Each structure stands twice: as C-alpha cells, then as structure tokens.
C-alpha cells in the first residue's frame, strides 16, 4: 500500500513538455522581443544596454500553448 502510495513529496519536471511548460512537440515560442536571449536591448541610442525580458521572465521562451498536464508551469509534485 504505502509502497505504491509513496506519500513523500518531491518535485518532477513535466517530461511531457520536457520540463519547459509548452504542450508536447509544440515547443515554447522563442521570445522575439529578446531574440530568444532572455534580455531586451534598451537601444536608447548610445546607451544600448539591456534589461531582463519581462514578457518571458528572462526565460527567452513564451508558453503560448500551456501544457495542460502541468497547467503551463513545466514541473509538478510527484502525483
Ligand atoms: Zn508540462
Ligand atoms: Zn523575452
């Protein structure tokens, strides 16, 4: 019983979305804003420094299509 019902919480990557968050096969959409590099270049003329892209929370990837299994998060508690 307890042998199968392994009631000892642990996190697992959603293998189905390969731990990302986008539906299987349907990979996360490369954030164009930061050219998939996770950082936007604040090209205010000379001072062309960068900022973390908020749109994709610096991950450079947009969960356009959320992996239902993990509600687009990308990882879940073993269950
Ligand atoms: Zn998933
Ligand atoms: Zn981005």
Swiss-Prot record:
Coiled coil: none annotated. It is found in: Cytoplasm. Interacts with DnaK and GrpE to disassemble a protein complex at the origins of replication of phage lambda and several plasmids. Participates actively in the response to hyperosmotic and heat shock by preventing the aggregation of stress-denatured proteins and by disaggregating proteins, also in an autonomous, DnaK-independent fashion. Unfolded proteins bind initially to DnaJ; upon interaction with the DnaJ-bound protein, DnaK hydrolyzes its bound ATP, resulting in the formation of a stable complex. Changing residue 67 to S: Loss of DnaK-independent chaperone activity. A zinc finger (CR-type) spans 1-79. The chain holds residues 131 to 209 of 376 of the full protein. Changing residue 31 to S: Loss of function. This is Chaperone protein DnaJ. Homodimer.
């Amino acid at each position: 019983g307890v042998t199968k019902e392994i009631r000892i919480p642990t996190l697992e990557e959603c293998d189905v979305c390969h731990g990302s968050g986008a539906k299987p096969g349907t990979q996360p959409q490369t954030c164009p804003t930061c050219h998939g590099s996770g950082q936007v270049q604040m090209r205010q003329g000379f001072f062309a420094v960068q900022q973390t892209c908020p749109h994709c929370q610096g991950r450079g990837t947009l969960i356009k299509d959320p992996c239902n299994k993990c509600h687009g998060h990308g990882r879940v508690e073993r269950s």
